[PDB]
């Protein structure tokens, strides 16, 4: 019912910058045509919290996705690039840490507040992409 730290993430966010995302997606194993169309997208990401359930929606010309979850409880997720993964999202020190597991592989997406931005850092082995969103 009352305020939680998680509320710093809540709201409507628009992508403003993307660095190294094509190389990150190659590491993930996204095919060419999907990478090109995904990398063009300027999604809006809508984060909300209801009781213990956090919802992250991405809306764009590429794909609309929506996940709902409870921190530390694994779920099934079909990602925007069409992987079928098992995901767990935790809050570590203020950072939401989202680990996706599929086919023996793993990718971690961290989201954090920096100034008025929500920074999303996507990591697959040694390759990192930084995506910066701002309030809509």
Ligand X SMILES: O=C(O)CCn1c(-c2ccccc2)cc2ccccc21
- Identify the sign of the CA torsion 29, 21, 85, 126: positive
Q: Using the minimum distance from each CB to ligand X, give the nearer residue, 51 or 86.
A: 86
Nearer to ligand X, 4 or 14 (CB): 14
102 binds ligand X (CB under 6 A): no
What sign for the dihedral angle of Cα 100, 103, 104, 105? negative
CB of 89 closer than 8 Å to CB of 69: yes
Smallest CA-to-CA distance from 122 within 28, 11, 32, 8 is with 28
Q: Which is nearer to ligand X, 2 or 76 (CB)?
A: 76
CA distances from 63 to 28, 48, 52 (A): 18, 19, 26
Candidate residues 47, 54, 118, 122; the one interacting with ligand X per rule CB under 6 A: 122
- Residue owning tokens 């628009």: 14
Map the footprint of ligand X across residues 20-79, applying CB under 6 A: 25, 28, 30, 38, 41, 43, 58, 60, 62-63, 79
> Is 133 labeled as ligand-binding?
yes
Which residues would be at the binding site for ligand X (CB under 6 A)? Answer: 25, 28, 30, 38, 41, 43, 58, 60, 62-63, 79-81, 120, 122, 131
Residue stretches of the annotated binding site: 131-133
């Amino acid at each position: 019912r009352g305020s939680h730290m998680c509320d710093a993430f809540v709201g409507t966010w628009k992508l403003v910058s993307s660095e190294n995302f094509d190389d990150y997606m190659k590491e993930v194993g996204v095919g060419f045509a999907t990478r090109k169309v995904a990398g063009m997208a300027k999604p809006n990401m809508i984060i909300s919290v209801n009781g213990d359930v956090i919802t992250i929606k991405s809306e764009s010309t590429f794909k609309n996705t929506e996940i709902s979850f409870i921190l530390g409880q694994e779920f099934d997720e079909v990602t925007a690039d069409d992987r079928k993964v098992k995901s767990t999202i935790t809050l570590d020190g203020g950072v939401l840490v989202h680990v996706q597991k599929w086919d023996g592989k793993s990718t971690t997406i961290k989201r954090k507040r920096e100034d008025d931005k929500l920074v999303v850092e996507c990591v697959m082995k040694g390759v990192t992409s930084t995506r910066v969103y701002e309030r809509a």
